[PDB]
């Protein structure tokens, strides 16, 4: 299991326990539920790039104690 560090806007450090097998689609939607907002409202930025639904931890280069940022999109959802 990989423990990613999600940096919240209020300095909240979220520890998302992911697995190097699942898709980031499941992760993106689950995080939205954790906050209580609809999917596509929050953009996940990794190294300046936005995490897509078909994205996988196998690509880009995700590891343990990795830093991922989450921001609210102008679309609102």
């Amino acid at each position: 299991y990989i423990k990613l560090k999600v940096i919240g806007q209020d300095s909240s450090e979220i520890h998302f326990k992911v697995k190097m097998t699942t898709h980031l689609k499941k992760l993106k939607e689950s995080y939205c539920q954790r906050q209580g907002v609809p999917m596509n409202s929050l953009r996940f930025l990794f190294e300046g790039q936005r995490i897509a639904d078909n994205h996988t931890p196998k690509e880009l280069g995700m590891e343990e104690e990795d830093v991922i940022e989450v921001y609210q999109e102008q679309t609102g959802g």
């Binding site: 300095s11 520890h15 697995k19 699942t22 689950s30 995080y31 954790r34």
Partner: peptide, 12 residues
Amino acid sequence: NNRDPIVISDSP
């Protein structure tokens, strides 16, 4: 200094 743990389920 705030840590929240979330667990994800993986589809076989």
